[PDB]
Amino acid sequence: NEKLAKKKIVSIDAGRKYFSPEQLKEIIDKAKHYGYTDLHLLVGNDGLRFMLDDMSITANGKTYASDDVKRAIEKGTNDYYNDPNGNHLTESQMTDLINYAKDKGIGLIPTVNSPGHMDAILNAMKELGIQNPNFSYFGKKSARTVDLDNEQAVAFTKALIDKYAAYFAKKTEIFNIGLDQYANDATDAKGWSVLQADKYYPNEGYPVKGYEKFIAYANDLARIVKSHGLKPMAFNDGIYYNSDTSFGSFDKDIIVSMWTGGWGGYDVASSKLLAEKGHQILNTNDAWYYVLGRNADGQGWYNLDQGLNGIKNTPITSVPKTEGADIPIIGGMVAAWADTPSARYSPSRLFKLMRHFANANAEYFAADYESAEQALNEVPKDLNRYTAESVTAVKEAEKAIRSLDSNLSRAQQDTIDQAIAKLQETVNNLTLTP
Ligand SMILES: CC(=O)N[C@H]1[C@H](O[C@H]2[C@@H](O)[C@H](O)[C@@H](CO)O[C@@H]2O)O[C@H](CO)[C@@H](O)[C@@H]1O
Ligand SMILES: [Mn+2]
Ligand SMILES: [Mn+2]
Ligand SMILES: [Mn+2]
Ligand SMILES: [Mn+2]
Ligand SMILES: [Mn+2]
Ligand SMILES: [Mn+2]
Ligand SMILES: [Mn+2]
Ligand SMILES: [Mn+2]
Ligand SMILES: [Mn+2]
């Protein structure tokens, strides 16, 4: 029961790339069928593809009008990638989506990313007239990352997160603030190093109090998310980067989506350290990643064959960078991304990824009872015209379905399937009294 109690989550990048309500419902249907508990839907990730009915934002001593914010965001998103399939989900569509998923026992966890991966929000702030929102590193300007020194850009971004969190209140449980990959473009994937650099290498032009400002920013977003009764979540790479606790402390109520163990010259906190500091961990191991369009071996990083290998070889309990410690988890999340958002979305390939993750960790995933429910609905209601012996067999086969444990795992699907087959056989064997 400890395994079944974990969250099993599929993540979809509907920030970079448009997904229709119809497509998202299909993903939810497959998630339910395969025994998942949640859909993790990025809506702000480079692109911003979710618009509230009221997008008025109060910051900087004024209100930015809802119509202008909407227009700024649509335009800013299109400047990132003008997706021929669509620009954004509406509030009505999101409310209906969350309700659709709720009726299937599927939760929804949104991401609206900052202070990185916010190309569209930066664009929108400029369309509104906010000056110089982008972070720059020695003359290289980031297209994705806000400058934490810019009070007006920061205040707007926070108010925008607040506006979305207010919407998601009471209809969801977790809100992912992201926080990954600060200034990845401008610093060539060294942004955390850069933010910490001035403390250790002063008078060299590194951002003064860079990392300390990032901690404060992260903590203020956590405060804002918690005020709405939501649990804040964030990706791990910037949290105690280089295992450095000397800049300040992150809010313990931030759940960590642990997606990377780091790489050469990019030294992240271990999951051991983060657990010790008091953070819950959602295992989001990039072993399982799939980037749309990279569909076979040789087609680049996080290609589908690599992700299926990752799922085969790295179980849901294997967290990045454990330092050999036993790391508890709240669950696991398999993620599909749209780094090249003009790539064709292939449902069957995403479903294969999701199915493989479910099958490789089958004791964790819920079983599927829907066919069992259907079979019970197909039993003839009135059995009086059949022989007592044939009737008893049917009643016994029905009782046996109703007596199945109601929280079986996917590993035990055969038990359900056998019970269905027995019922069908007994119904087929109903014999009319002569
Ligand atoms: C949390 C997360 O998964 N973030 C991104 C991550 O990014 C890639 C890649 O885009 C970066 O260039 C490198 C160096 O920082 O890191 C990762 O390899 O993985 C996903 C798949 O590429 C992205 O879609 C995520 O946005
Ligand atoms: Mn107007
Ligand atoms: Mn641009
Ligand atoms: Mn159901
Ligand atoms: Mn500065
Ligand atoms: Mn180090
Ligand atoms: Mn292959
Ligand atoms: Mn049902
Ligand atoms: Mn049904
Ligand atoms: Mn039980």
XYZ file of C-alpha atoms and ligand atoms in Angstrom:
469
model
C 0.000 0.000 0.000
C 2.968 2.343 0.469
C 3.799 1.916 -3.230
C 0.248 2.484 -4.481
C 0.000 5.592 -2.240
C 2.754 7.366 -4.173
C 1.954 9.939 -6.830
C 2.491 8.752 -10.414
C 2.644 11.747 -12.680
C 2.981 12.461 -16.399
C 4.399 15.846 -17.286
C 3.510 17.694 -20.480
C 5.239 20.815 -21.825
C 2.279 22.925 -22.984
C 4.354 26.062 -22.362
C 6.616 25.813 -25.397
C 4.011 24.113 -27.519
C 0.179 24.325 -27.810
C -1.937 21.312 -26.725
C -5.665 21.423 -27.274
C -8.259 20.610 -24.600
C -9.089 17.514 -26.725
C -5.431 16.367 -26.771
C -5.061 16.941 -22.997
C -8.212 14.967 -22.279
C -6.815 12.039 -24.303
C -3.620 12.203 -22.221
C -5.683 12.258 -19.028
C -7.679 9.205 -20.283
C -4.453 7.235 -20.882
C -2.995 8.380 -17.550
C -6.104 7.113 -15.732
C -6.039 3.827 -17.692
C -2.331 3.214 -16.955
C -2.777 3.911 -13.213
C -1.340 7.422 -12.846
C -2.583 9.927 -10.247
C -1.770 13.302 -11.839
C -1.146 15.352 -14.920
C 1.650 17.905 -14.490
C 0.838 20.567 -17.114
C 3.442 23.256 -17.776
C 1.540 26.278 -19.141
C 4.272 28.851 -18.597
C 7.578 27.415 -19.871
C 9.248 29.735 -22.431
C 5.829 30.258 -24.001
C 2.866 31.176 -21.812
C -0.258 29.382 -23.009
C -2.946 29.891 -20.396
C -5.052 33.068 -20.101
C -7.404 33.931 -17.228
C -10.679 35.836 -17.866
C -9.292 38.718 -15.765
C -5.562 39.236 -16.432
C -5.364 42.727 -14.861
C -2.150 42.892 -12.832
C -1.464 45.288 -10.027
C 2.219 46.098 -9.523
C 4.574 49.024 -9.742
C 2.046 51.482 -8.277
C -0.514 50.831 -10.990
C -2.733 48.295 -12.624
C -1.919 46.924 -16.072
C -5.253 46.468 -17.853
C -6.474 42.923 -18.448
C -6.888 43.458 -22.225
C -3.324 44.809 -22.523
C -1.845 41.997 -20.427
C -3.671 39.441 -22.585
C -2.493 41.089 -25.819
C 1.064 41.398 -24.443
C 1.156 37.716 -23.451
C -0.379 36.403 -26.738
C 2.167 38.504 -28.641
C 5.041 37.570 -26.378
C 4.256 33.874 -26.733
C 4.056 34.135 -30.525
C 7.429 35.853 -30.564
C 8.793 32.748 -28.771
C 6.924 30.340 -31.115
C 3.858 31.118 -33.157
C 2.213 27.705 -33.005
C -0.142 27.110 -35.948
C -2.229 24.800 -33.738
C -3.153 27.424 -31.188
C -1.900 30.125 -28.829
C -3.361 29.438 -25.329
C -5.969 27.657 -23.257
C -8.741 29.870 -21.844
C -10.017 29.897 -18.270
C -13.189 28.043 -19.280
C -11.115 25.370 -20.994
C -8.810 24.937 -17.999
C -11.702 24.773 -15.514
C -13.372 22.142 -17.675
C -10.080 20.256 -18.026
C -9.425 20.149 -14.284
C -13.004 19.002 -13.703
C -12.696 16.324 -16.410
C -9.529 15.023 -14.735
C -11.033 15.264 -11.238
C -13.966 13.042 -12.269
C -11.379 10.462 -13.388
C -9.429 10.730 -10.079
C -6.605 12.582 -11.843
C -5.158 15.730 -10.269
C -3.660 18.613 -12.252
C -0.404 20.355 -11.244
C 0.322 23.537 -13.300
C 3.745 25.134 -13.845
C 4.213 28.803 -14.579
C 7.971 29.065 -14.765
C 10.224 31.843 -13.561
C 12.807 33.410 -13.126
C 14.109 31.324 -16.090
C 12.092 29.872 -18.951
C 9.901 32.965 -19.106
C 10.576 34.271 -22.650
C 6.876 35.166 -23.164
C 6.498 36.929 -19.799
C 9.635 39.012 -20.516
C 8.190 39.899 -23.924
C 4.834 40.761 -22.381
C 6.445 43.014 -19.750
C 8.212 44.919 -22.574
C 4.952 45.236 -24.567
C 3.397 46.748 -21.423
C 6.346 49.184 -21.243
C 8.402 47.797 -18.375
C 12.075 48.601 -19.101
C 15.024 46.158 -19.375
C 13.480 43.134 -17.743
C 16.003 40.590 -19.168
C 19.120 39.378 -17.304
C 22.407 40.010 -19.187
C 25.798 38.388 -18.637
C 28.774 40.425 -19.873
C 26.808 41.812 -22.842
C 24.955 38.604 -23.650
C 21.239 39.145 -23.053
C 19.099 36.209 -21.886
C 15.899 35.692 -23.875
C 14.391 33.565 -21.059
C 15.541 34.979 -17.780
C 14.498 38.034 -15.719
C 17.043 40.259 -13.999
C 16.463 39.951 -10.214
C 17.821 43.512 -9.786
C 14.906 44.902 -11.774
C 12.268 45.626 -9.103
C 9.530 46.483 -11.621
C 10.047 43.269 -13.670
C 10.240 41.193 -10.487
C 7.120 42.811 -8.938
C 5.125 42.217 -12.134
C 6.265 38.607 -12.449
C 5.354 37.867 -8.832
C 1.892 39.490 -9.263
C 1.353 37.400 -12.407
C 2.218 34.190 -10.464
C -0.155 35.359 -7.690
C -2.958 35.886 -10.218
C -2.569 32.334 -11.564
C -2.193 30.813 -8.061
C -5.450 32.545 -7.062
C -7.185 30.804 -9.940
C -5.682 27.387 -9.120
C -6.601 27.658 -5.406
C -9.023 24.967 -4.183
C -9.095 23.203 -7.582
C -5.509 21.831 -7.431
C -3.034 20.972 -4.621
C 0.469 21.745 -5.942
C 1.734 24.644 -8.047
C 5.154 24.345 -9.677
C 7.064 27.636 -9.666
C 9.835 25.980 -11.737
C 13.038 27.864 -10.840
C 15.190 25.741 -13.182
C 18.133 26.776 -15.334
C 18.746 30.409 -14.527
C 20.108 32.265 -17.653
C 20.965 28.985 -19.380
C 21.348 30.814 -22.728
C 23.340 33.858 -21.653
C 25.779 31.937 -19.394
C 26.036 28.675 -21.396
C 24.327 26.641 -18.654
C 26.404 28.193 -15.795
C 23.766 30.509 -14.341
C 23.808 29.261 -10.747
C 27.643 29.480 -10.737
C 27.281 33.023 -12.014
C 24.713 33.993 -9.353
C 27.026 32.659 -6.599
C 30.267 33.947 -8.153
C 30.509 37.448 -6.637
C 30.656 36.119 -3.044
C 33.780 34.056 -3.846
C 35.268 36.142 -6.685
C 34.442 39.766 -5.784
C 35.366 42.797 -7.915
C 35.143 40.772 -11.151
C 31.751 42.047 -12.346
C 29.602 39.104 -11.247
C 26.011 39.916 -10.135
C 26.164 41.329 -6.604
C 24.036 39.304 -4.171
C 22.821 37.322 -7.228
C 22.163 34.007 -5.515
C 20.917 35.629 -2.302
C 18.351 37.557 -4.401
C 17.358 34.267 -6.025
C 16.741 32.652 -2.650
C 14.556 35.614 -1.615
C 12.693 35.448 -4.919
C 12.091 31.703 -4.560
C 10.909 32.158 -0.966
C 8.544 34.994 -1.890
C 6.991 32.844 -4.652
C 6.613 30.007 -2.116
C 4.904 32.440 0.311
C 2.563 33.617 -2.446
C 1.693 30.043 -3.530
C 1.128 28.925 0.077
C -1.152 31.891 0.792
C -3.529 30.310 -1.759
C -3.415 27.015 0.137
C -1.292 25.369 -2.567
C 1.927 23.482 -2.002
C 4.797 25.088 -3.912
C 7.056 22.831 -6.008
C 10.285 23.603 -7.862
C 12.950 21.890 -9.913
C 16.087 20.985 -8.021
C 19.043 22.426 -9.921
C 19.030 25.903 -8.330
C 18.213 24.751 -4.779
C 21.372 24.844 -2.681
C 23.439 24.844 -5.878
C 26.989 23.509 -5.304
C 25.597 22.260 -1.924
C 26.100 25.819 -0.735
C 23.940 26.654 2.323
C 25.853 29.853 3.078
C 23.672 32.297 1.037
C 20.475 31.613 2.995
C 17.760 28.965 3.268
C 14.988 27.853 0.964
C 11.448 27.513 2.339
C 11.081 23.860 3.453
C 7.496 23.793 2.218
C 8.866 23.784 -1.376
C 8.519 20.234 -2.753
C 11.583 19.462 -4.910
C 11.094 17.994 -8.378
C 14.430 16.224 -8.579
C 15.142 15.943 -12.273
C 18.939 16.168 -12.593
C 21.999 14.867 -10.828
C 24.084 17.584 -12.504
C 26.987 17.105 -14.881
C 30.602 18.198 -15.377
C 31.005 21.705 -13.936
C 27.342 21.854 -12.893
C 27.281 20.707 -9.314
C 23.813 20.384 -7.834
C 22.820 19.625 -4.248
C 22.324 15.883 -3.691
C 18.817 14.606 -3.020
C 20.345 13.524 0.337
C 21.102 17.128 1.231
C 17.658 18.330 0.133
C 15.896 15.604 2.165
C 18.077 16.496 5.175
C 17.112 20.152 4.806
C 13.489 19.033 5.141
C 12.190 19.018 1.538
C 9.830 16.388 0.196
C 11.015 15.038 -3.163
C 9.092 14.168 -6.298
C 11.397 11.886 -8.345
C 11.480 13.469 -11.812
C 14.558 11.609 -13.043
C 15.661 12.819 -16.534
C 16.530 9.216 -17.282
C 12.864 9.043 -18.390
C 12.691 12.273 -20.462
C 11.369 12.423 -24.025
C 11.721 15.484 -26.276
C 9.004 15.481 -28.947
C 10.373 14.785 -32.426
C 13.478 12.984 -31.172
C 11.894 9.678 -31.886
C 14.660 7.081 -32.122
C 18.264 6.312 -31.213
C 20.675 8.811 -32.744
C 18.067 11.638 -32.937
C 19.495 13.598 -30.002
C 19.293 13.882 -26.264
C 16.188 12.558 -24.505
C 15.154 10.712 -27.686
C 12.342 8.197 -27.280
C 14.628 5.144 -27.351
C 16.862 6.717 -24.695
C 13.800 7.457 -22.520
C 12.440 3.931 -22.849
C 15.952 2.674 -21.889
C 15.905 5.021 -18.885
C 12.498 3.658 -17.853
C 13.752 0.052 -18.267
C 16.902 0.702 -16.235
C 16.064 3.341 -13.649
C 13.128 2.403 -11.413
C 10.714 4.955 -9.911
C 12.619 4.702 -6.574
C 16.006 5.683 -8.120
C 16.358 9.442 -7.414
C 19.134 11.582 -8.970
C 22.305 12.059 -6.887
C 21.551 10.131 -3.703
C 25.170 9.960 -2.459
C 24.173 6.337 -1.660
C 21.516 7.390 0.869
C 17.971 6.008 1.111
C 15.872 8.857 -0.328
C 12.147 8.868 0.375
C 9.898 10.071 -2.445
C 6.312 11.364 -2.774
C 6.142 9.655 -6.167
C 7.635 9.752 -9.659
C 7.090 11.876 -12.710
C 7.854 10.975 -16.319
C 8.220 14.076 -18.498
C 7.666 14.910 -22.181
C 9.085 18.182 -23.455
C 8.750 20.367 -26.540
C 12.222 21.933 -26.794
C 11.613 22.129 -30.557
C 7.956 23.075 -30.398
C 7.440 22.840 -34.196
C 8.022 19.077 -33.790
C 4.958 16.947 -34.493
C 3.216 15.726 -31.372
C 2.719 11.948 -31.625
C 0.174 10.665 -29.134
C 1.133 7.034 -29.695
C 4.773 7.746 -28.860
C 3.851 9.656 -25.691
C 1.430 6.855 -24.724
C 4.186 4.298 -25.256
C 6.457 6.249 -22.909
C 3.669 6.529 -20.301
C 2.769 2.822 -20.698
C 6.403 1.735 -20.300
C 6.814 3.790 -17.105
C 3.657 2.190 -15.737
C 4.737 -1.337 -16.722
C 8.293 -0.999 -15.415
C 7.000 0.080 -11.994
C 3.761 -1.903 -11.992
C 3.452 -2.336 -8.230
C 3.221 1.473 -7.911
C 0.546 2.039 -10.528
C -3.181 1.533 -9.934
C -4.944 -1.298 -11.690
C -7.793 -0.667 -14.176
C -11.281 -1.620 -13.055
C -13.232 0.105 -15.830
C -13.685 -3.093 -17.893
C -14.755 -4.906 -14.760
C -17.413 -2.195 -14.145
C -18.555 -2.489 -17.764
C -18.793 -6.266 -17.548
C -20.990 -5.980 -14.437
C -23.198 -3.523 -16.381
C -23.540 -6.072 -19.208
C -24.904 -8.878 -16.980
C -28.607 -9.611 -17.821
C -30.678 -7.934 -15.071
C -33.323 -10.665 -14.893
C -32.209 -14.239 -14.558
C -35.549 -15.924 -13.712
C -35.841 -17.701 -17.094
C -32.525 -19.493 -16.664
C -31.715 -22.713 -14.798
C -30.883 -22.470 -11.089
C -27.463 -24.015 -11.704
C -26.531 -21.570 -14.488
C -27.901 -18.640 -12.415
C -25.854 -19.582 -9.351
C -22.638 -19.623 -11.500
C -23.353 -16.085 -12.733
C -24.155 -14.814 -9.203
C -20.876 -16.365 -7.952
C -18.832 -14.822 -10.785
C -20.414 -11.413 -10.008
C -19.677 -11.762 -6.293
C -16.068 -12.635 -7.159
C -15.642 -9.402 -9.145
C -17.258 -7.374 -6.370
C -14.899 -9.071 -3.894
C -11.691 -8.047 -5.681
C -9.441 -5.874 -3.594
C -10.392 -2.327 -4.633
C -6.759 -1.057 -4.598
C -4.869 -3.614 -6.702
C -1.815 -2.578 -8.630
C -1.141 -2.803 -12.308
C 1.142 -5.801 -11.435
C -2.056 -7.596 -10.406
C -4.164 -6.711 -13.466
C -4.430 -10.407 -14.425
C -6.498 -11.049 -11.294
C -9.109 -8.552 -12.477
C -8.974 -9.748 -16.113
C -9.471 -13.381 -15.055
C -12.485 -12.393 -12.966
C -14.007 -10.591 -15.994
C -13.419 -13.593 -18.197
C -15.088 -15.878 -15.648
C -18.162 -13.622 -15.513
C -18.413 -13.521 -19.333
C -18.151 -17.297 -19.490
C -20.841 -17.841 -16.861
C -23.170 -15.381 -18.608
C -22.541 -17.210 -21.945
C -23.414 -20.445 -20.178
C -26.815 -19.222 -18.902
C -29.206 -21.923 -19.942
C -32.932 -21.368 -20.524
C -35.187 -23.584 -18.386
C -37.071 -25.839 -20.855
C 13.606 20.926 -15.429
C 14.002 20.635 -16.853
O 13.905 19.489 -17.299
N 14.449 21.671 -17.582
C 14.819 21.585 -18.987
C 15.885 20.509 -19.321
O 16.786 21.212 -20.188
C 17.769 20.468 -20.901
C 18.411 21.405 -21.948
O 17.463 22.224 -22.608
C 19.432 22.353 -21.342
O 20.022 23.068 -22.405
C 20.444 21.542 -20.522
C 21.552 22.386 -19.890
O 20.990 23.224 -18.907
O 19.709 20.865 -19.496
C 18.843 19.855 -19.984
O 19.652 18.927 -20.680
O 15.377 19.335 -19.929
C 14.252 19.387 -20.808
C 14.550 18.513 -22.041
O 15.542 19.055 -22.919
C 13.800 20.816 -21.140
O 12.641 20.777 -21.959
C 13.508 21.467 -19.797
O 12.956 22.755 -19.976
Mn -8.269 48.871 -23.570
Mn 12.215 37.075 -28.929
Mn -14.000 5.533 -13.046
Mn 23.589 43.610 -10.098
Mn 31.352 21.942 -6.255
Mn 16.054 2.558 -32.232
Mn -16.448 3.793 -14.338
Mn -17.487 3.274 -17.361
Mn -6.510 -3.781 0.141
